[PDB]
Amino acid sequence: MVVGWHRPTRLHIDTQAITENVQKECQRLPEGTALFAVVKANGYGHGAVESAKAAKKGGATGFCVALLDEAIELREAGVQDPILILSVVDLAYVPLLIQYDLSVTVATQEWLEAALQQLTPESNTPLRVHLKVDTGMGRIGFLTPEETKQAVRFVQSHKEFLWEGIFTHFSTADEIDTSYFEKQAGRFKAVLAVLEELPRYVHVSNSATALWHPDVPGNMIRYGVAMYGLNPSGNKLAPSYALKPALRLTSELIHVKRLAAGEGIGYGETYVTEAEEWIGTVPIGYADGWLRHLQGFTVLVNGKRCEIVGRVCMDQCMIRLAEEVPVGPVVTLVGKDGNEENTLQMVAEKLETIHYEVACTFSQRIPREYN
Amino acid sequence: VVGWHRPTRLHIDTQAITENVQKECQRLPEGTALFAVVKANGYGHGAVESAKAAKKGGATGFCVALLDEAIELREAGVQDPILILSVVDLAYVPLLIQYDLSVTVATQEWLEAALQQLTPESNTPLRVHLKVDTGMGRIGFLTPEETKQAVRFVQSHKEFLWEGIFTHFSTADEIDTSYFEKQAGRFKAVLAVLEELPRYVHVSNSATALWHPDVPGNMIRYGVAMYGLNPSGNKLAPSYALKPALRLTSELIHVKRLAAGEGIGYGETYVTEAEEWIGTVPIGYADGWLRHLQGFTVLVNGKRCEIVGRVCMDQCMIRLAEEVPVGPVVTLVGKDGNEENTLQMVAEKLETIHYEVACTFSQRIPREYN
Ligand SMILES: Cc1ncc(COP(=O)(O)O)c(C=O)c1O
Numbered sequence: 023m024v025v026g027w028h029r030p031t032r033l034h035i036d037t038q039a040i041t042e043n044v045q046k047e048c049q050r051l052p053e054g055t056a057l058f059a060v061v062k063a064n065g066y067g068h069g070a071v072e073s074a075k076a077a078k079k080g081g082a083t084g085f086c087v088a089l090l091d092e093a094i095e096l097r098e099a100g101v102q103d104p105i106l107i108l109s110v111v112d113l114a115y116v117p118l119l120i121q122y123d124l125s126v127t128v129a130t131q132e133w134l135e136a137a138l139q140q141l142t143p144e145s146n147t148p149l150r151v152h153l154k155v156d157t158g159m160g161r162i163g164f165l166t167p168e169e170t171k172q173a174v175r176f177v178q179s180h181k182e183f184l185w186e187g188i189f190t191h192f193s194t195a196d197e198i199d200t201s202y203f204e205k206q207a208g209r210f211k212a213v214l215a216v217l218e219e220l221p222r223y224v225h226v227s228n229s230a231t232a233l234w235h236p237d238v239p240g241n242m243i244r245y246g247v248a249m250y251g252l253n254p255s256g257n258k259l260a261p262s263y264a265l266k267p268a269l270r271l272t273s274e275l276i277h278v279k280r281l282a283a284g285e286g287i288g289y290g291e292t293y294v295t296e297a298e299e300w301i302g303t304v305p306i307g308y309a310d311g312w313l314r315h316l317q318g319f320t321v322l323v324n325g326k327r328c329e330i331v332g333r334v335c336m337d338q339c340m341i342r343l344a345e346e347v348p349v350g351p352v353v354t355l356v357g358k359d360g361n362e363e364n365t366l367q368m369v370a371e372k373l374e375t376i377h378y379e380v381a382c383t384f385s386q387r388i389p390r391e392y393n
Numbered sequence: 394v395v396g397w398h399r400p401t402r403l404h405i406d407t408q409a410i411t412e413n414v415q416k417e418c419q420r421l422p423e424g425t426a427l428f429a430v431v432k433a434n435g436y437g438h439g440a441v442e443s444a445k446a447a448k449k450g451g452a453t454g455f456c457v458a459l460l461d462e463a464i465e466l467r468e469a470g471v472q473d474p475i476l477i478l479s480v481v482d483l484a485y486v487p488l489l490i491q492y493d494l495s496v497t498v499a500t501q502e503w504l505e506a507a508l509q510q511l512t513p514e515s516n517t518p519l520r521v522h523l524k525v526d527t528g529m530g531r532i533g534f535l536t537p538e539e540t541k542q543a544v545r546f547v548q549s550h551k552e553f554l555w556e557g558i559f560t561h562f563s564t565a566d567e568i569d570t571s572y573f574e575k576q577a578g579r580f581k582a583v584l585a586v587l588e589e590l591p592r593y594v595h596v597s598n599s600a601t602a603l604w605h606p607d608v609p610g611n612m613i614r615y616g617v618a619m620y621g622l623n624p625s626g627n628k629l630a631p632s633y634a635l636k637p638a639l640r641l642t643s644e645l646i647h648v649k650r651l652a653a654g655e656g657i658g659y660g661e662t663y664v665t666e667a668e669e670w671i672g673t674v675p676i677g678y679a680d681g682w683l684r685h686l687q688g689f690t691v692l693v694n695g696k697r698c699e700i701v702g703r704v705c706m707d708q709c710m711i712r713l714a715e716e717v718p719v720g721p722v723v724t725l726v727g728k729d730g731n732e733e734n735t736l737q738m739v740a741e742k743l744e745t746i747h748y749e750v751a752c753t754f755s756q757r758i759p760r761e762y763n
């Protein structure tokens with residue numbers, strides 16, 4: 023697939039915003055605490071490499087990725103810092119981990135026992151492994167205190183290995199009620215407790231934890247959404263410091279026409295003109311990530327809100343303009359214009375999801391520009 | 394970034410796309426041509442590999458939405474006619490000319506302006522396809538009086554060619570054919586002022602081709618049907634057996650048994666009602682597998698497995714029946730045993746149409762062909 027360069031639709035990524043967002047968080051964490059920038063899913067749709075480079079200038083000394091291929095892309099970009107693949111890697115790819123000196127998470131001894139084989143008798147390239155203990159997310163990890171204790175000692179029983187860290191992940195750190203959270207921490211504590219040695223990286227925090235549960239054991243935080251300026255808790259809580267939106271979505275009217283009252287517009291004729299109306303055509307559709315369920319949403323033109331009317335097409339949608347306008351004026355889908363602003367949170371709410379998903383859904387067909 | 398190292402894949406059955414195009418071509422007046430619309434990267438399946446498959450099947454032309462897309466096709470070796478269905482900014486007229494691409498024209502001014510930039514020259518015309526708006530409400534000339542001036546203008550200057558004219562139906566798949574007839578009537582009008590017609594007079598898409606085969610015109614823009622999807626969703630039965638060409642797969646990468654009353658996934662939305670085996674599948678909403686796919690069930694060893702707990706950005710959890718090890722294949726879309734998952738179903742869950750599900754599957758999921 024290609025990216026719509028010759029089309030007015032565009033995604034603007036304010037890099038400095040990321041940097042600012044990262045710097046400010048670094049300032050609120052102890053001097054013995056590292057900031058790892060998690061840029062998975064192509065930097066949550068903003069672009070990994072750039073998010074990665076912007077995150078570094080802010081104080082980040084490590085990176086968190088979700089796939090082997092994503093960790094490799096960073097290396098290929100010149101990223102020379104620790105990179106942690108947040109999930110289970112296929113044994114068939116162990117050698118790749120050694121080649122790019124990537125850090126992997128381990129969730130079972132089975133993987134480690136098999137990983138040992140296919141691993142040089144004494145390699146000068148030990149495999150950096152972070153053991154994940156699952157005290158509540160229910161996804162992956164050891165359900166120790168005993169299981170981890172066995173995993174760790176096994177990891178140290180072999181020069182082929184090198185355990186960089188041990189971590190857990192909270193499922194409700196963005197929740198008003200903190201009862202469940204406190205339980206996960208208990209399970210993590212119960213469990214470093216059974217050990218006698220600790221790796222260099224003991225991490226448990228994500229954006230939400232870092233913002234609302236600061237006084238929590240650990241020396242390294244995995245900073246995600248917050249660095250792109252998005253409130254990790256939707257609109258349930260206020261960040262500890264003013265985040266700064268890094269994503270803007272722009273397009274332009276490429277056709278403007280007046281329709282008589284009583285005319286149907288779009289598929290299924292879900293909409294019918296109520297009177298003389300000015301309808302403008304915008305070159306962005308669901309195939310670009312501007313989902314169909316966005317119909318009643320309003321975008322910006324010349325500082326005024328305009329209702330998308332009618333079914334959102336695959337490659338475009340229609341907005342009822344306020345007053346007659348030529349084609350060409352810029353249409354702000356996400357971002358500020360005049361006294362009005364469209365937040366990714368707003369789009370998420372219209373879609374009944376979280377901005378996490380909205381940002382990740384924006385197709386690659388939409389060119390991203392960084393400044 | 395393509396996740397080639399992740400056990401998650403998208404299987405495109407090109408032979409299927411080919412067969413779908415063929416059967417259409419056979420029930421077609423034959424004299425009438427079939428143009429394969431492959432915008433949005435072949436509706437998520439891959440534009441080039443789809444086009445190529447549709448040509449083997451009988452397609453003698455292509456429909457794209459973006460100038461960029463048309464150039465992908467050309468640079469890929471496609472010498473057949475490529476029609477850009479949207480309006481192309483004037484500043485890119487030279488490129489249309491360069492790659493000899495057909496362009497949609499929905500206004501008079503565009504034509505008058507493009508003329509100046511055109512010639513000055515006497516070599517290759519600008520293949521124009523005029524579009525009248527008789528209902529959709531999107532782009533195009535909205536009266537028969539207009540377009541008349543258009544074709545009149547186009548046929549006057551040797552810079553253009555007027556390769557065709559068309560319109561687009563908005564409800565060609567609704568059981569109620571009311572609004573469909575209206576549009577057909579207006580496009581009828583319309584033609585009923587022109588004393589000549591261009592090489593192509595297209596009007597129908599998947600839906601109308603499948604249910605309104607008797608509508609006038611000599612070429613159809615075959616869209617979703619070639620991909621094996623019911624253009625009406627589940628409202629009408631396809632005029633012929635469509636073979637879906639898309640399949641989505643992955644595999645279990647972590648299996649475990651949880652105690653009763655154990656929470657799973659963000660917000661702790663799911664709680665074990667008793668000891669059970671949970672599975673972890675490497676695919677989440679960042680791949681297009683949306684959060685609202687929560688209650689949905691996938692297939693492993695020919696058995697439904699409910700996706701429990703929240704869907705994460707990169708993966709999700711499923712409840713397994715028997716226990717079992719890591720490695721089994723997970724069919725999110727397709728057949729497995731006697732069970733089957735359709736985009737339709739996936740569409741039903743998300744509460745939208747398969748068109749959308751297809752186009753949302755992230756670039757991060759490797760497409761494999763055969
Ligand atoms: C294990 C893990 N930690 C941290 C993050 C980041 O959390 P958040 O994006 O809320 O800050 C994610 C990223 O994909 C992750 O799954």
Ligand SMILES: Cc1ncc(COP(=O)(O)O)c(C=O)c1O
Nearest residue numbers: 430432561598599614615616617
């Ligand atoms: C004008 C036109 N015809 C055909 C296709 C739609 O064909 P189908 O409805 O079969 O998907 C498209 C979409 O890109 C198009 O807009």
